[PDB]
Amino acid sequence: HVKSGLQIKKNAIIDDYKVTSQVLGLGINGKVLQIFNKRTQEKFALKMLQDCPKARREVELHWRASQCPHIVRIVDVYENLYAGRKCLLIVMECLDGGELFSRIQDRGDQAFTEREASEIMKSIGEAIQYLHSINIAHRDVKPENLLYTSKRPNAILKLTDFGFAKETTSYVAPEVLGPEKYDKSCDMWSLGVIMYILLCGYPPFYSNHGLAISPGMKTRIRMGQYEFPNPEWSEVSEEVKMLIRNLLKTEPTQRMTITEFMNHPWIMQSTKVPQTPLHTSRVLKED
Amino acid sequence: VKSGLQIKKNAIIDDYKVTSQVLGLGINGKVLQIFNKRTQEKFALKMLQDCPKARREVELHWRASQCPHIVRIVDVYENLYAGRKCLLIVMECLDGGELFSRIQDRGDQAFTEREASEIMKSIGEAIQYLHSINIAHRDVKPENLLYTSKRPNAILKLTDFGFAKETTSVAPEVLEKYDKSCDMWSLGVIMYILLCGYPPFYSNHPGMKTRIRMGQYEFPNPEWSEVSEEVKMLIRNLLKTEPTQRMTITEFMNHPWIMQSTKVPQTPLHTSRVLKE
Amino acid sequence: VKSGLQIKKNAIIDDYKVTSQVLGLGINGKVLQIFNKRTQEKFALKMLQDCPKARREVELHWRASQCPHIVRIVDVYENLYAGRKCLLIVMECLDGGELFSRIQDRGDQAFTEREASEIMKSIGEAIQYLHSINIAHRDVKPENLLYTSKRPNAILKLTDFGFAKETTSYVAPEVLYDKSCDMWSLGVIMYILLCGYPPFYSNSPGMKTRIRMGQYEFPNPEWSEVSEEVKMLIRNLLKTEPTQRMTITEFMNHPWIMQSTKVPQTPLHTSRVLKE
Amino acid sequence: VKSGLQIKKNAIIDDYKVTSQVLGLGINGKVLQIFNKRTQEKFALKMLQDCPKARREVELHWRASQCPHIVRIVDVYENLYAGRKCLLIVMECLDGGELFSRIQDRGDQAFTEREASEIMKSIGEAIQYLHSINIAHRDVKPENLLYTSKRPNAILKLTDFGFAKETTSYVAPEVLYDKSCDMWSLGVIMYILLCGYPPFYSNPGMKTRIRMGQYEFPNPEWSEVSEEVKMLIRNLLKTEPTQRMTITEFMNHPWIMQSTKVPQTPLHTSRVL
Ligand SMILES: CCOc1ccc(Nc2c(C)c(N[C@H]3CCCNC3)nc3ccnn23)cc1
Ligand SMILES: CCOc1ccc(Nc2c(C)c(N[C@H]3CCCNC3)nc3ccnn23)cc1
Ligand SMILES: CCOc1ccc(Nc2c(C)c(N[C@H]3CCCNC3)nc3ccnn23)cc1
Ligand SMILES: CCOc1ccc(Nc2c(C)c(N[C@H]3CCCNC3)nc3ccnn23)cc1
Ligand SMILES: CCOc1ccc(Nc2c(C)c(N[C@H]3CCCNC3)nc3ccnn23)cc1
Ligand SMILES: CCOc1ccc(Nc2c(C)c(N[C@H]3CCCNC3)nc3ccnn23)cc1
Ligand SMILES: CCOc1ccc(Nc2c(C)c(N[C@H]3CCCNC3)nc3ccnn23)cc1
Ligand SMILES: CCOc1ccc(Nc2c(C)c(N[C@H]3CCCNC3)nc3ccnn23)cc1
């Protein structure tokens, strides 16, 4: 019930971890680097920010969310001096099994099934449900930020990267309590996009000639123009399509909420959803 | 066309046997029974210190008064009391007690699903009038729904306009924001309670505040088991988290469960047991 | 890729036989007929005193003209008139009358729900083009829906961009209301189409009430044989909460607008009523 | 030189037996007793939602804590609770009850004037420390004066710093209203001590009688109570804030400074109370 708060360490991180001058330099350059504990040889990941207001917010919000085990665990935070400047060094449990879609795509010809889609969506949404229950919107939930702990077949999938996260707030109706300004609802848009990609292998909005954002692509996003083409959507439920339809709603306030998402039959009873085979792994493997 | 509000300036005791000590509780913010001098018939008195809010309250409540589902104001006095200018509102006396406490005093016949609907239809009548003239009540809770008398044929009325606001300042949007919609939230909560006997959100011992914010609530068994998905869906539309997703009072009033109370089954509810106990 | 608006600055009478009387008329917001001099072919003229709002309209109308369900601008002129700079707009001449004028020059042949559907899809096509290039018309009423001619294959076009606005400054749309009232308008027009009078109407502070409140029914006789699928669709377009309203994409993908040849040919009181 | 405040970050439950039945209660204002895990010794717990207001309280209170007439802060935790961030303040447990709570239980006529003086000296010493480090408590009311133990000479202590403000950022002092609030309150309290009811009350015009500063020293109650005291009270209760004496002037007031020399006449306080 009561959760310990963030103690940012001030000692040098190289005390506790074999950090090189090499990786450390890729770190400020945004790279996320694998480093090793020196007591144990256990491996971890290091993300490096320059101590600034935004960086502080990231660490604080991520620290809160770390309680939930579908979110990547922060082991320690350092505030050290590097290149004269002061910066935050975040050490996480190392997620080593790769990005969500990489796993799926490199696995043939073991089909991905709709049921694996549902299980995967059930656990992302659990993470989002936790974040919204404490008034954080992640606001950057994309495939690049969902990684598997290990290649182990039972690896668990975790949400990463909180540099866009925001506190959603500083007979009584809910709005009466806090601002309604809607960052929580784009986490919901994002679930929609991931769910969509999981069932077919490609996103609902895309570029043809590819692959940067198209002006065509932006219009289609803004219009809300997408379809459920054959061959890849033909065995998928109408119930699943309707669910994607509610999440990809253009009007944010028309969008389903995480509580409604989690109570949806398809999410709530993954283990009952058919193991209908999908084109996801082929489409994905085909790049 | 209805009459404007005329605040009477002469001392209220010119006209009502008002104790000086009723006046003393009156100031604390108590509604008090008082009597006419000619008629010797009983009325209700609440007292406000004259200020912009009180002026707003009398003003909005007065306009609302045309609706008979709203407690009637007999007249309004502006008197000096304890040195200050302050507002004295005389109302019809609502002698029936509050919505629930009535419902829990019971045992003869069964409080049925149909009684719930008829009740929700009349609170809805009140709300629909308010909103149609661009006032939002904003404090529609049970303690503000009183029965006229103790007769079975008592008529339920809405009270306390201390939080009311004008929502006003072709597509309907070209001709307000979020005030009207919490009246509908409230209708949701009240309707929920009318059907089972407890509220949809509650403290079991910040959880409750979270559950409201997330919109986590059940339709638990046993007591919700006889209620249809139609009624469930209507409550779901009202308890919507995002205000703009909520039903408007016009849609509510045109919902078949409300519009056709007649046609709704007199199936027994657990409301009265739960409430008593 | 299509060309930009090149506003001509030469005297318009160099090109069209425009009389001083029509210029005077056209100054008063009347739309007038003129003729090319090379060709003697027929056109429509409307005159705005040049000002930033007049400039907005021309700029937006030009953009939308790309789409053939929008009246075509053929030339824009900036000339002096009464010593004031002003804009003269030459459009394709729409000669088939207003949408509802044609329907009520019918009886007593049927006007069916299916034809209703098709007309609606037609207007919808205009609105879809606008929105997708971020323009809201904001004046979609019946008298801005004129037909090209009275030939059987005349097309219905949207006119009058005097209230038009740019709606504009794994990523949500709200990142990359005007449009939503266009859609309230589709509902009004659709509602009228299916029965022959408006959903809200004069009876005026009382009518502003009925609008704000959403107060309208689907009375009989006239709505009795009309399909529930339609009534639901109107119910969404006419929603009081704008964000609750359906979008133009969602409108064009609706089975009633999409698959017309499975909306029944059920006859409507529309022409009979429009007449009376 | 005393140590600064070292807000701990580990679960408060690593150290104390904070049954989750207390959190949700303590989180809305209740002060709950808890126990140190290793010593089982009991303590009190106050929980604030972590904000600048809250952080101000802990800091000012930590500073006041060196004065043994302020309740002592044992330590302060910062923890996530229900995903919100909040400060957990662990104090020495004051288990003797509210100052007046005890005086009630006195036997009619037992509580003396000499006692009242000794108490006011005692409350007085707290105010004096606060003001001398530029803190004004601003909520010195009876329910914030609690007794340590129940022992006969258990020491009385000022609690609750939720309203405390720093009264600041040949020379004249002014060249360097909040403290004067504290001195009014010593006045009301001193008054209650001597008769058993306040100078302002109802049987409201009570907001006029304060503004007008109209109160009496009614008999039978006030009849044998000295005049130098009545006069002390009349300064403190001055309507005009600048007219009130300071805490230094109060600590040097003979009735305060030399309680020894003040006679033990009985008051109707207990009975009345
Ligand atoms: C030799 C490869 O070195 C590795 C090995 C494993 C990781 N793990 C990982 C990586 C690659 C990482 N990459 C983030 C980069 C930014 C987008 N989201 C993914 N973030 C996290 C957070 C916790 N671990 N983790 C990173 C680098
Ligand atoms: C039937 C539609 O087929 C298409 C046609 C084109 C694309 N384009 C494309 C594809 C195939 C795509 N695939 C990503 C899916 C998620 C993993 N990374 C690859 N991502 C993007 C981003 C912008 N476009 N784009 C995708 C699917
Ligand atoms: C013994 C007579 O005491 C009475 C008798 C009847 C009433 N009636 C009543 C009462 C008790 C009353 N109470 C409000 C108090 C504040 C909460 N909402 C209800 N408001 C109104 C408005 C019109 N009447 N009425 C009040 C007191
Ligand atoms: C049996 C369902 O579980 C619960 C759980 C908690 C409660 N709580 C409770 C109950 C029973 C309750 N009941 C009142 C509802 C309004 C009319 N008078 C009774 N009001 C409130 C407000 C906050 N909680 N709370 C009641 C039932
Ligand atoms: C005798 C010729 O008179 C005509 C003949 C045809 C037209 N055509 C027409 C007319 C009558 C016209 N009238 C607008 C007037 C303002 C309301 N919206 C319709 N607007 C347009 C735009 C393109 N053509 N067109 C106008 C006048
Ligand atoms: C069954 C209700 O019948 C009525 C009664 C009155 C009206 N009023 C009216 C009617 C009948 C009406 N009829 C047509 C005028 C020509 C364009 N389409 C609508 N237009 C307007 C515009 C403003 N009001 N109004 C409409 C329908
Ligand atoms: C639940 C156990 O019962 C106790 C036993 C002792 C306490 N002690 C106490 C209590 C009751 C307490 N109560 C505050 C409540 C708010 C008014 N000021 C006094 N404040 C303090 C500060 C230091 N201790 N202490 C509180 C509760
Ligand atoms: C000789 C006058 O005797 C009275 C008569 C009435 C009062 N009223 C009253 C009394 C007796 C009073 N007594 C409390 C004093 C503080 C300790 N708890 C008891 N407190 C308050 C607060 C507001 N009024 N009020 C006090 C004294």
Short mmCIF file of N, CA, C and O in Angstrom, two decimals, chain B residues 153-212:
data_model
loop_
_atom_site.label_atom_id
_atom_site.label_comp_id
_atom_site.label_asym_id
_atom_site.label_seq_id
_atom_site.Cartn_x
_atom_site.Cartn_y
_atom_site.Cartn_z
N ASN B 153 -49.89 10.43 -2.66
CA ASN B 153 -49.95 11.23 -3.87
C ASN B 153 -49.11 12.50 -3.71
O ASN B 153 -49.45 13.57 -4.25
N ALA B 154 -48.02 12.37 -2.96
CA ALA B 154 -47.07 13.45 -2.78
C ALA B 154 -46.28 13.63 -4.06
O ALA B 154 -46.00 12.67 -4.78
N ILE B 155 -45.92 14.88 -4.35
CA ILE B 155 -45.16 15.21 -5.54
C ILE B 155 -43.76 15.67 -5.15
O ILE B 155 -43.60 16.52 -4.29
N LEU B 156 -42.76 15.09 -5.82
CA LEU B 156 -41.35 15.25 -5.47
C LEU B 156 -40.87 16.55 -6.09
O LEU B 156 -41.27 16.88 -7.19
N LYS B 157 -40.02 17.28 -5.37
CA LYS B 157 -39.52 18.57 -5.86
C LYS B 157 -38.04 18.80 -5.62
O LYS B 157 -37.47 18.30 -4.66
N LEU B 158 -37.40 19.56 -6.51
CA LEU B 158 -35.97 19.84 -6.38
C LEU B 158 -35.76 21.15 -5.62
O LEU B 158 -36.56 22.08 -5.74
N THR B 159 -34.70 21.22 -4.82
CA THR B 159 -34.47 22.37 -3.95
C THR B 159 -33.01 22.82 -4.03
O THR B 159 -32.20 22.21 -4.72
N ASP B 160 -32.69 23.89 -3.32
CA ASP B 160 -31.33 24.37 -3.17
C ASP B 160 -30.62 24.76 -4.47
O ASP B 160 -29.91 23.96 -5.09
N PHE B 161 -30.79 26.02 -4.86
CA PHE B 161 -30.16 26.54 -6.05
C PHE B 161 -28.90 27.35 -5.76
O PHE B 161 -28.51 28.22 -6.52
N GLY B 162 -28.25 27.02 -4.65
CA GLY B 162 -27.06 27.72 -4.24
C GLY B 162 -25.86 27.49 -5.13
O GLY B 162 -24.89 28.24 -5.08
N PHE B 163 -25.92 26.45 -5.96
CA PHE B 163 -24.85 26.16 -6.89
C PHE B 163 -25.26 26.37 -8.35
O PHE B 163 -24.44 26.24 -9.25
N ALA B 164 -26.52 26.70 -8.58
CA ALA B 164 -27.01 26.83 -9.95
C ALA B 164 -26.24 27.90 -10.73
O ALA B 164 -25.71 28.85 -10.14
N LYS B 165 -26.15 27.74 -12.05
CA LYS B 165 -25.48 28.71 -12.91
C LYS B 165 -26.21 28.84 -14.25
O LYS B 165 -26.68 27.84 -14.80
N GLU B 166 -26.29 30.05 -14.79
CA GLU B 166 -26.71 30.19 -16.18
C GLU B 166 -25.62 29.58 -17.04
O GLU B 166 -24.45 29.89 -16.88
N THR B 167 -26.02 28.71 -17.96
CA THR B 167 -25.08 28.03 -18.82
C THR B 167 -24.86 28.84 -20.08
O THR B 167 -23.89 28.63 -20.81
N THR B 168 -25.78 29.76 -20.34
CA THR B 168 -25.68 30.64 -21.49
C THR B 168 -24.55 31.63 -21.30
O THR B 168 -23.95 31.69 -20.23
N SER B 169 -24.26 32.39 -22.34
CA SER B 169 -23.30 33.48 -22.25
C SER B 169 -24.00 34.78 -21.87
O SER B 169 -25.18 34.97 -22.19
N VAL B 170 -28.90 27.20 -38.15
CA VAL B 170 -27.77 27.37 -37.24
C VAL B 170 -27.56 26.10 -36.41
O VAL B 170 -28.52 25.39 -36.10
N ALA B 171 -26.31 25.83 -36.05
CA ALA B 171 -25.97 24.67 -35.24
C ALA B 171 -26.14 25.00 -33.77
O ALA B 171 -25.88 26.12 -33.34
N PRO B 172 -26.56 24.01 -32.97
CA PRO B 172 -26.86 24.31 -31.57
C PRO B 172 -25.67 24.93 -30.84
O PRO B 172 -25.84 25.60 -29.83
N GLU B 173 -24.47 24.70 -31.36
CA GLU B 173 -23.26 25.17 -30.69
C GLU B 173 -23.00 26.63 -31.01
O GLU B 173 -22.33 27.33 -30.26
N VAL B 174 -23.55 27.10 -32.12
CA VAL B 174 -23.40 28.49 -32.52
C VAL B 174 -24.26 29.37 -31.62
O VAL B 174 -23.85 30.47 -31.24
N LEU B 175 -25.44 28.87 -31.28
CA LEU B 175 -26.33 29.57 -30.37
C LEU B 175 -25.83 29.39 -28.94
O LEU B 175 -24.78 28.78 -28.71
N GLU B 176 -22.31 26.83 -24.18
CA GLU B 176 -22.04 26.42 -22.81
C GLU B 176 -21.04 25.27 -22.75
O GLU B 176 -20.57 24.79 -23.79
N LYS B 177 -20.69 24.84 -21.54
CA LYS B 177 -19.61 23.87 -21.38
C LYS B 177 -19.62 23.16 -20.03
O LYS B 177 -19.11 23.69 -19.04
N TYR B 178 -20.21 21.97 -19.99
CA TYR B 178 -19.90 20.98 -18.96
C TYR B 178 -20.70 21.06 -17.67
O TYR B 178 -20.72 20.11 -16.89
N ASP B 179 -21.37 22.19 -17.42
CA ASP B 179 -22.22 22.33 -16.25
C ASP B 179 -23.50 21.53 -16.35
O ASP B 179 -23.87 20.80 -15.42
N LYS B 180 -24.18 21.66 -17.48
CA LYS B 180 -25.39 20.90 -17.76
C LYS B 180 -25.16 19.40 -17.59
O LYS B 180 -26.07 18.66 -17.19
N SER B 181 -23.94 18.97 -17.88
CA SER B 181 -23.63 17.56 -18.02
C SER B 181 -23.40 16.89 -16.69
O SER B 181 -23.42 15.66 -16.59
N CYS B 182 -23.16 17.68 -15.65
CA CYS B 182 -22.97 17.07 -14.35
C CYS B 182 -24.31 16.91 -13.65
O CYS B 182 -24.44 16.07 -12.77
N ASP B 183 -25.31 17.67 -14.08
CA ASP B 183 -26.68 17.34 -13.73
C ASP B 183 -27.03 15.93 -14.20
O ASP B 183 -27.78 15.21 -13.55
N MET B 184 -26.48 15.52 -15.34
CA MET B 184 -26.84 14.22 -15.90
C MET B 184 -26.04 13.11 -15.24
O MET B 184 -26.56 12.02 -15.04
N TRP B 185 -24.79 13.39 -14.90
CA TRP B 185 -24.03 12.52 -14.01
C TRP B 185 -24.83 12.21 -12.75
O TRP B 185 -24.98 11.06 -12.35
N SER B 186 -25.32 13.27 -12.13
CA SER B 186 -26.06 13.16 -10.89
C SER B 186 -27.28 12.30 -11.06
O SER B 186 -27.58 11.47 -10.19
N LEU B 187 -27.99 12.49 -12.17
CA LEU B 187 -29.15 11.67 -12.48
C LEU B 187 -28.72 10.22 -12.55
O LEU B 187 -29.39 9.33 -12.02
N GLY B 188 -27.59 9.99 -13.20
CA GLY B 188 -27.02 8.66 -13.21
C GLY B 188 -26.87 8.09 -11.81
O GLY B 188 -27.35 6.98 -11.55
N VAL B 189 -26.21 8.82 -10.91
CA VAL B 189 -25.94 8.27 -9.59
C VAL B 189 -27.24 7.98 -8.86
O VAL B 189 -27.43 6.89 -8.32
N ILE B 190 -28.14 8.96 -8.85
CA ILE B 190 -29.43 8.79 -8.19
C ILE B 190 -30.18 7.60 -8.77
O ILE B 190 -30.67 6.75 -8.03
N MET B 191 -30.26 7.52 -10.10
CA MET B 191 -30.95 6.40 -10.70
C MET B 191 -30.32 5.08 -10.28
O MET B 191 -31.02 4.12 -10.00
N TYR B 192 -29.00 5.04 -10.24
CA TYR B 192 -28.29 3.84 -9.81
C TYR B 192 -28.75 3.42 -8.43
O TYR B 192 -29.13 2.27 -8.23
N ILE B 193 -28.71 4.36 -7.48
CA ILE B 193 -29.20 4.10 -6.12
C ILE B 193 -30.68 3.71 -6.05
O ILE B 193 -31.04 2.80 -5.31
N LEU B 194 -31.53 4.39 -6.81
CA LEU B 194 -32.94 4.06 -6.76
C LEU B 194 -33.18 2.58 -7.05
O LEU B 194 -34.17 2.02 -6.59
N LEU B 195 -32.28 1.96 -7.81
CA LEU B 195 -32.52 0.60 -8.28
C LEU B 195 -31.96 -0.50 -7.38
O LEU B 195 -32.40 -1.66 -7.47
N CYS B 196 -30.99 -0.17 -6.54
CA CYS B 196 -30.36 -1.19 -5.73
C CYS B 196 -30.26 -0.83 -4.25
O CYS B 196 -30.26 -1.71 -3.39
N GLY B 197 -30.18 0.46 -3.94
CA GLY B 197 -30.12 0.86 -2.55
C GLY B 197 -28.79 1.40 -2.08
O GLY B 197 -28.71 1.99 -1.00
N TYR B 198 -27.72 1.22 -2.86
CA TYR B 198 -26.43 1.83 -2.56
C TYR B 198 -25.91 2.59 -3.77
O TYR B 198 -26.43 2.44 -4.87
N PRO B 199 -24.87 3.43 -3.59
CA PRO B 199 -24.30 4.22 -4.69
C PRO B 199 -23.29 3.42 -5.50
O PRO B 199 -22.78 2.41 -5.03
N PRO B 200 -23.00 3.85 -6.74
CA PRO B 200 -22.04 3.18 -7.63
C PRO B 200 -20.57 3.38 -7.24
O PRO B 200 -19.72 2.59 -7.60
N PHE B 201 -20.28 4.46 -6.51
CA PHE B 201 -18.92 4.72 -6.04
C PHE B 201 -18.97 4.98 -4.54
O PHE B 201 -19.84 5.70 -4.07
N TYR B 202 -18.02 4.43 -3.80
CA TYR B 202 -18.04 4.57 -2.36
C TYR B 202 -16.71 4.19 -1.72
O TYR B 202 -15.93 3.44 -2.30
N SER B 203 -16.47 4.71 -0.52
CA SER B 203 -15.36 4.24 0.30
C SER B 203 -15.74 2.95 1.01
O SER B 203 -16.79 2.85 1.64
N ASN B 204 -14.87 1.95 0.91
CA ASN B 204 -15.12 0.66 1.53
C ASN B 204 -14.67 0.64 2.99
O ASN B 204 -15.22 -0.08 3.81
N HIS B 205 -13.66 1.46 3.30
CA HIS B 205 -13.17 1.61 4.66
C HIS B 205 -13.82 2.81 5.33
O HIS B 205 -14.99 3.11 5.10
N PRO B 206 -9.52 7.98 -1.61
CA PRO B 206 -8.60 8.06 -2.76
C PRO B 206 -8.84 6.90 -3.71
O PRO B 206 -8.75 7.05 -4.93
N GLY B 207 -9.15 5.74 -3.15
CA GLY B 207 -9.72 4.68 -3.95
C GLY B 207 -11.01 5.18 -4.59
O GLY B 207 -11.14 5.18 -5.81
N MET B 208 -11.95 5.61 -3.77
CA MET B 208 -13.25 6.06 -4.26
C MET B 208 -13.08 7.16 -5.29
O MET B 208 -13.80 7.21 -6.29
N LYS B 209 -12.12 8.04 -5.06
CA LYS B 209 -11.88 9.16 -5.96
C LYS B 209 -11.27 8.62 -7.25
O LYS B 209 -11.55 9.12 -8.34
N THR B 210 -10.44 7.60 -7.12
CA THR B 210 -9.88 6.97 -8.30
C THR B 210 -10.95 6.24 -9.08
O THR B 210 -11.05 6.39 -10.30
N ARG B 211 -11.75 5.44 -8.39
CA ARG B 211 -12.80 4.68 -9.05
C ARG B 211 -13.80 5.58 -9.78
O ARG B 211 -14.32 5.20 -10.83
N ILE B 212 -14.06 6.76 -9.25
CA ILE B 212 -14.94 7.68 -9.96
C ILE B 212 -14.22 8.18 -11.22
O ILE B 212 -14.81 8.30 -12.29
#
